[PDB]
């Protein structure tokens, strides 16, 4: 049993007609001190999977190391490591899921909330969640922490049920995701303006975008607001 120290906030994601999108800002908080600013919380595994991690950063780095090994190991005595026997998103997930639950079962959790985003070899989209309790679930949209409260409501307005997926495009989806990131920057006190976004499309493959920024921010109305009730000036 432990307690998180350096932490990463929300990880949001959804699936559209051709793939999945996932994003996470680049902040590593230390309590209310916005300490680190170049933290990449999106871990690509191969070219069909991206693992988004929130929670304890030291634990995330550990999980990051476990993933590099998965790759190295899957390569051993595997002539089809980059073909039929390459790591599938489902394999990577089932693995992390296994670990997360074994660890909570030993009363020594990996203090994270994880979302595995990817496209299976048969083109199927993959999006599942697993946290420190070893709890797992899928849904057209998935977000951790704050994103669960603020991002999901927005993203679900785009893909409310399974059937809405084939009707959603990378443009519509990426747009939703980016607006969500702006909202989170507005109301989450543990968020950064800078973030990374990744797309895993069954055609264009994996597109990883770094150093994005929340733009188009409404603040002007703040000038017309003075006092907290009766104050006029």
């Amino acid at each position: 049993t432990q307690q998180p120290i350096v932490t990463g906030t929300s990880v949001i994601s959804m699936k559209y007609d051709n793939g999945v999108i996932i994003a996470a800002d680049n902040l590593g908080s230390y309590g209310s001190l916005l300490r680190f600013n170049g933290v990449e919380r999106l871990i690509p595994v191969g070219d069909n999977t991206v693992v988004g991690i929130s929670g304890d950063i030291s634990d995330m780095q550990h999980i990051e190391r476990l993933l590099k090994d998965l790759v190295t190991e899957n390569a051993y005595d595997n002539p089809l490591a980059d073909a039929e026997e390459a790591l599938e998103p489902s394999y990577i997930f089932e693995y992390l899921a296994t670990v997360m639950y074994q660890r909570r079962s030993k009363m020594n959790p990996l203090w994270n909330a994880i979302i595995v985003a990817g496209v299976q070899s048969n083109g199927d989209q993959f999006l599942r969640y697993v946290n420190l309790l070893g709890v797992t679930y899928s849904s057209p949209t998935l977000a951790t922490g704050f994103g669960a409260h603020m991002a999901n409501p927005l993203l679900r307005k785009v893909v409310d049920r399974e059937s809405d997926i084939p009707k959603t495009t990378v443009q519509v989806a990426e747009e939703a995701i980016v607006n969500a990131m702006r909202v989170l920057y507005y109301r989450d006190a543990r968020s950064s303006r800078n973030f990374s976004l990744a797309i895993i499309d069954k055609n264009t493959g994996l597109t990883f975008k770094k150093n994005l920024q929340v733009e188009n921010m409404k603040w002007d109305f703040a000038k017309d607001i003075k006092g907290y009730g009766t104050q006029k000036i």
Binding site: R65, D69, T72, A75, Y76, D77, P79
Partner: protein, 244 residues
């Protein structure tokens, strides 16, 4: 007296360890394999005897990768080779886990060296029935190595072991003389394809399948990779041509 060759860690009157020597026999009795150090990497090649048409071609892969930058090939008791590679893999994983940086080839060699040497210390174990040629690229250069059942090993310019090791060593020495400046990755691959073909005469009776792999700073980015398709066929011909 006698019997000095029945137990593994026993010194015979002349200071030898016969069991280790008998292991070397199993090695010589095996397929021929080689390694060629080039100007920025290394190439590994091996002879795969085709016992029959029933063996699926291109399948029973012999060369093995350790970590992501090391190649290993061996002649002798195959299962013993795998065992040693497994150990090397654990050996390499542990090193990277503590030091972060992938294991330097020299460091890796001593890991395999110490492990193999260890199996000549007790009579409760048998020495490894294989000689291994391995190497790769690291923080500073490419390195080629060969490890004997005794646990002995050195850095090589070129190395060979197995049935037709003599042919090979001869061919390798020629290259060493005729290229004091250093062969290239591309070149070594062909050269290797040839030397295996030549050395295959000491086994000309059975048909075989050639296998090559390389690790070049410029050709593979310092990552061990198998020579497949075109590059492979191109080298298979370069040999078939110079074998006549």
């Amino acid at each position: 007296g006698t019997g000095y060759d029945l137990s593994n860690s026993v010194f015979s009157p002349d200071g030898r360890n016969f069991q280790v020597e008998y292991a070397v026999k199993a090695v010589e009795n095996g397929t021929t394999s080689i390694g060629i150090k080039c100007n920025d990497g290394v190439v590994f090649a091996v002879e795969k005897l085709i016992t029959s048409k029933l063996l699926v071609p291109q399948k029973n892969v012999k060369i093995q990768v350790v970590d992501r930058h090391i190649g290993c090939v061996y002649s002798g008791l195959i299962p013993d080779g795998r065992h040693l590679v497994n150990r090397g893999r654990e050996e390499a994983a542990s090193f990277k886990k503590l030091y972060k940086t992938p294991i330097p080839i020299p460091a890796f060699a001593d890991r395999l060296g110490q492990y193999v040497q260890a199996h000549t210390l007790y009579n409760s174990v048998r020495p490894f029935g294989v000689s291994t040629i391995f190497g790769g690229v690291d923080k500073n250069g490419a390195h080629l190595y060969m490890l004997e059942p005794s646990g002995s090993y050195w850095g090589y310019k070129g190395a060979a072991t197995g049935k037709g090791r003599q042919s090979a060593k001869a061919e390798l020495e020629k290259l060493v003389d005729h290229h004091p400046e250093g062969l290239s990755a591309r070149e070594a691959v062909k050269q290797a394809a040839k030397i295996i073909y030549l050395a295959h005469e000491d086994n000309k009776e059975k048909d075989f399948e050639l296998e090559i792999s390389w690790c070049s700073l410029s050709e593979t980015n310092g990552l061990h990779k198998f020579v497949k398709g075109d590059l492979l066929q191109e080298a298979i011909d370069f040999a078939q041509k110079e074998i006549n």
